[PDB]
Amino acid sequence: MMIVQRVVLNSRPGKNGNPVAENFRMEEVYLPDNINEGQVQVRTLYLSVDPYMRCRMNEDTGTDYITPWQLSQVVDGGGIGIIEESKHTNLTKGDFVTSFYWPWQTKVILDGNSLEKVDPQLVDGHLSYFLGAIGMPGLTSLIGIQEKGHITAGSNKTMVVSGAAGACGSVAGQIGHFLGCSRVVGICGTHEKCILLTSELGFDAAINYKKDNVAEQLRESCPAGVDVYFDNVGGNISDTVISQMNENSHIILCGQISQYNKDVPYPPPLSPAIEAIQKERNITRERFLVLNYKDKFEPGILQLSQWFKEGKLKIKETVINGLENMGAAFQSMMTGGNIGKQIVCISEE
Numbered sequence: 352m353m354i355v356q357r358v359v360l361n362s363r364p365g366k367n368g369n370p371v372a373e374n375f376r377m378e379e380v381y382l383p384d385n386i387n388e389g390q391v392q393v394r395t396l397y398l399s400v401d402p403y404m405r406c407r408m409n410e411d412t413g414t415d416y417i418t419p420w421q422l423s424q425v426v427d428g429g430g431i432g433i434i435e436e437s438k439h440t441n442l443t444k445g446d447f448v449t450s451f452y453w454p455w456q457t458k459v460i461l462d463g464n465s466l467e468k469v470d471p472q473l474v475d476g477h478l479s480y481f482l483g484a485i486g487m488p489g490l491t492s493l494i495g496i497q498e499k500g501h502i503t504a505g506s507n508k509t510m511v512v513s514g515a516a517g518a519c520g521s522v523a524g525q526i527g528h529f530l531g532c533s534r535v536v537g538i539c540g541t542h543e544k545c546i547l548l549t550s551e552l553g554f555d556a557a558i559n560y561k562k563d564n565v566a567e568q569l570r571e572s573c574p575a576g577v578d579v580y581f582d583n584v585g586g587n588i589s590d591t592v593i594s595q596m597n598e599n600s601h602i603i604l605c606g607q608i609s610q611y612n613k614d615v616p617y618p619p620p621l622s623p624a625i626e627a628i629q630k631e632r633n634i635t636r637e638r639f640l641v642l643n644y645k646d647k648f649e650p651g652i653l654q655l656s657q658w659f660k661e662g663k664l665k666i667k668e669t670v671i672n673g674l675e676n677m678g679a680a681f682q683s684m685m686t687g688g689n690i691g692k693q694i695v696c697i698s699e700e
């Protein structure tokens with residue numbers, strides 16, 4: 352058997368704690384030389400780190416749809432890789448495949464049914480985009496705007512995006528334009544991120560929530576009020592944005608990342624005063640889970656790919672190399688180290 356590398360859950364940061372590299376541990380294991388029927392053996396190419404992973408580090412995730420990682424047991428999540436051998440009928444050597452439950456391990460044997468074959472033509476050979484803008488986060492943004500945004504052509508709505516330079520947010524804000532908003536405004540945590548948004552991703556305006564006065568800034572940037580709020584962050588920023596939303600406007604409730612290191616239910620409730628404004632202005636704020644919309648993934652991916660291949664959709668990702676950097680990359684992502692999608696390159700390939 353060959354010796355490969357592996358990441359396991361070393362320790363829990365606690366429900367109110369910050370996630371650290373050392374919550375994860377590298378190990379070496381043997382990879383069997385034989386596989387069975389229905390199984391395939393894959394070389395891992397890229398792994399995703401994602402904010403929903405935060406809850407899996409707690410003993411309870413607080414939801415059926417997600418189970419907690421176990422200590423000393425290998426961690427798993429979004430991944431893309433290439434088949435090195437298969438005894439699964441629909442899969443053969445050289446196929447590129449993805450899984451939501453890819454073990455953080457350099458080579459791995461999996462059940463052939465848990466995989467889906469991807470077409471590199473969609474991403475122009477840039478496989479990592481399948482875990483970002485042409486994957487789950489891109490779908491979340493496009494489908495979210497579609498199902499919850501209530502943007503019509505012929506309208507000239509203003510959209511605001513929180514977490515606007517992360518995976519979801521960088522994409523959401525371009526889709527906003529594509530779908531006929533007349534104004535898209537971004538809130539992110541760095542000056543460098545604001546530049547990306549206004550100069551590369553074509554956001555009409557960019558605000559830094561750490562160094563700026565968000566409210567004053569939204570007033571200048573959203574002179575007609577906010578009709579759509581694509582919300583990835585929650586907390587105090589969402590409070591500012593909602594205070595300035597128009598009547599019958601819409602919050603796309605994507606994530607609430609500022610709350611992820613706190614012991615509080617999801618989704619958290621608006622404060623009494625902000626809830627009051629929400630009800631008074633007939634603002635919609637419904638829970639959005641992309642996984643409830645599986646049968647729109649096809650068109651979704653086809654659309655995003657199409658926009659990318661037309662030069663319309665701009666894809667940003669931040670790549671770190673090496674399986675022994677998963678922990679560090681998750682920490683970096685949780686604390687705004689990533690521009691666009693945080694991706695880990697597992698292979699010398």
Ligand SMILES: NC(=O)c1ccc[n+]([C@@H]2O[C@H](COP(=O)([O-])OP(=O)(O)OC[C@H]3O[C@@H](n4cnc5c(N)ncnc54)[C@H](OP(=O)(O)O)[C@@H]3O)[C@@H](O)[C@H]2O)c1
Nearest residue numbers: 491517518519539540583605606607608609639640641687
């Ligand atoms: N509803 C669904 O089905 C679904 C599917 C995918 C993702 N999500 C949600 O979408 C959001 C973003 O996910 P993502 O994959 O696109 O990750 P990401 O945005 O690419 O990266 C996470 C970012 O959140 C920002 N952030 C972290 N802590 C913050 C705080 N306390 N206050 C304000 N901003 C903070 C950081 O950038 P800054 O420097 O800008 O602070 C960081 O880069 C999350 O809430 C996630 O859970 C929902």
